[PDB]
Write a protein that binds this ligand. Structure first.
Ligand SMILES: Nc1ncnc2c1ncn2[C@@H]1O[C@H](COP(=O)(O)O)[C@@H](O)[C@H]1O
Length: 263
């Protein structure tokens, strides 16, 4: 485990979280408890989910100085987050859980999260439409939250030093900006189209038709009919998947959902 040791990066994360004594913070991963201490100083209460009980002496040290820290010994991917009353999340994430934890957290909901990821993952999360790093992850996150990289974090900020840079990412859920009609269909639609990111949406959907439970012939005919509904749809489905904006992918998928349900 590469512990975050550089207090300057702890400070940047904590600052980005805009904490007050009315906030309740979830942290994932205890590490040395440096970040934990700063959270406890500034927030009402902090929950820490930590899988490795050999880190208990760090927990015990903290609990001597702070009365507002609760340690949950367990797997963050398994814990029922619905049962905890946090409004913010601040963590140097265990990188291996980056994707599922992000969506688990977003599903549960929060006012704001400030999370450290490996740099390449963060770049993908925030990537602009039509760029090399833009993909399913980018749209999956940006359709649900405003995201931005707060700071790049060098290997030297950790001990032992990792092989790659990390990045602090601020995530602010934003449900009403894009308004997903049906989350499960949206998820299936994203999966299908990003299996062929350099093809037109139309051709991607045909190739991946089985991801939406249609055979290739069915899907071809569906899209013929769909394209005839209006000129905007025609223009969207003929563009390359990775070139459509998040707004356009959300609206296209919403329209397609409504189309299929009507049919
Ligand atoms: N799924 C998990 N839930 C809670 N804590 C974890 C989980 N996975 C790893 N950790 C802890 O987070 C620390 C950072 O993860 P890692 O740097 O990927 O080894 C590790 O030392 C573990 O103690």
């Amino acid at each position: 485990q590469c512990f975050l040791i550089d207090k300057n990066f702890v400070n940047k994360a904590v600052e980005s979280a805009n904490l007050t004594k009315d906030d309740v913070v979830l942290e994932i991963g205890l590490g040395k408890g440096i970040l934990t201490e700063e959270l406890a100083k500034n927030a009402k209460k902090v929950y820490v989910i930590e899988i490795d009980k050999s880190l208990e002496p760090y927990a015990n040290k903290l609990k001597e100085l702070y009365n507002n820290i609760e340690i949950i010994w367990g797997d963050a991917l398994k814990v029922d987050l619905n049962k905890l009353d946090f409004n913010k999340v601040v963590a140097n994430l265990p990188y291996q859980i980056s994707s599922p934890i992000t969506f688990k957290l977003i599903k549960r909901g929060f006012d704001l999260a400030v999370l450290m990821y490996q740099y390449e993952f963060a770049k993908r999360m925030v990537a602009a439409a039509g760029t090399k790093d833009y993909g399913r992850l980018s749209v999956a996150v940006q359709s649900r939250a405003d995201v931005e990289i707060v700071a790049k974090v060098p290997p030297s900020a950790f001990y032992p030093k990792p092989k790659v840079y990390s990045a602090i990412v601020k995530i602010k859920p934003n449900k009403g900006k894009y308004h997903i009609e049906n989350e499960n269909f949206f998820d299936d639609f994203l999966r299908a189209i990003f299996q062929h990111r350099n093809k037109s949406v139309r051709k991607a959907l045909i190739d991946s038709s089985k991801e939406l439970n249609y055979n290739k012939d069915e899907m071809k005919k569906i899209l013929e009919d769909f394209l005839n509904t209006n000129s905007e749809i025609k223009n969207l489905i003929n563009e390359k998947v990775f070139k459509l904006s998040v707004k356009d992918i959300v609206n296209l998928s919403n329209e397609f959902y409504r189309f299929l349900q009507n049919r």
